[model samples]
Target: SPGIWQLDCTHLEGKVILVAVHVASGYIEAEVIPAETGQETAYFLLKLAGRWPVKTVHTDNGSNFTSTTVKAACWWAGIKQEFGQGVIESMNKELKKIIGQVRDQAEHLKTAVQMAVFIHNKKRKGGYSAGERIVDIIATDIQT
Candidate 1:
């Protein structure tokens, strides 16, 4: 659960929003880049790896994701890159709605995405929120 993530980039206004959603508990870590064409897909991918232990990343067959830079980053991180099978495609709708609302609130487009992720992760879902869940997951991984 800590190892699997769904990846996708959403282009809005002048920035690209890269969303990395954990499948276990709908845990999300989203960030922004300038464009998908500039070879920074790894910028977002590596961020996910740095934050959590990522075993596999599922993404569309888009060239941006399948590019050499991205491929190398996955190998470097030891993350298996899988194509298609978008689990978070539907959930993106709810996420984007938040981004839209935050976009109306002010700040640069990146902060709009930044605020959306924090707001989504802070809730107590059935007792613990996403961050709390990951804390235990990592603790378990290290203990085991």
Candidate 2:
């Protein structure tokens, strides 16, 4: 149902992208190009207002997160950002499923890609459906 296209990220090269998610509601926020922490990530976080209600944010010990940009964003958004927890390696597998099934075959990826992320943030898992993102509270639910 989808096809793939090649795109370039000339601006985002060499930066750690921020991909934030709301665990319970399954709403997602992301940016590929990022500055090294401080206000860049914070600006994006602050921009998330009216889109999703964020309570807590978790990250690895990346200096970008510790930078002033992220700090102000967290403070204004009232979304606490916590660090230093065991990483979950399941996103690749999980996201890949949707990509393979839906996004990969689509003719237009811009909308499809966004919808893929939308579905990922909202996919249901009950019985054996198995989207651990919905079930793995420990992997997703972190409080800062």
Candidate 3:
């Protein structure tokens, strides 16, 4: 159950927020960035790696993700990279539903995204709305 995650950026009211979702546990790490440039995405992922036990990351075919700098950063950090699109798209959908429409202001959008992440982590995954917390699952050592 080693960590495998997907990375993506969601745009709301012209603001950008990068998200990384753990595949096994649905735990998420996110950040509001000025733009979706390669440097930003690479730096964001590196910073996230420093905080989480990130072993692998997947992203869509966006140029920001496939750029040379991002690839180099991932390689240096020992994080494997892949090209995919489904996971993060689904994540964005769920987040949008919870967050609703966002204002164009950065602070407001960022706070909304943070609240969305908090609510998402607390959500129950299995029956009866009673299941393990996503954050709790992320705290444990996951073996392959």
**Candidate with best lDDT:** 1
lDDT of 2: 0.47
Give all candidate RMSDs, comma-separated. Answer: 2.4, 9.2, 3.7
lDDT of 2 by residue, 1-144 (tens): 001111112122244444554444343444554444456666666776545445555543445466666677777767664432112224434444564567555665444445556667666555322234434543444332
Error of 3 at 29 (Å): 1.4
Alpha carbon RMSD to native, model 2: 9.2
Candidate 1: Cα lDDT at 14 = 66
Model 1 over residues 1-144: C-alpha lDDT tens digits?
A: 567888778878866787878876677888777676536778677777897888988766456565788888888888886543344765577688888888877678788787888877776767998777777777887887
Model 2 — TM-score against the truth?
0.53
Off by over 4 Å in 2: 1-17, 25-27, 34-39, 83-88, 103-112, 127-144
lDDT of each: 0.75, 0.47, 0.70
Residue ranges of candidate 1 with Cα displaced over 4 Å: 83-87
TM-scores of all models? Answer: 0.83, 0.53, 0.77
What would the per-residue lDDT of candidate 3 be over residues 16-96, giving only the tens digit for each residue? Answer: 878777776656778889988889988987887787777887766456567887988888788886543454566678877
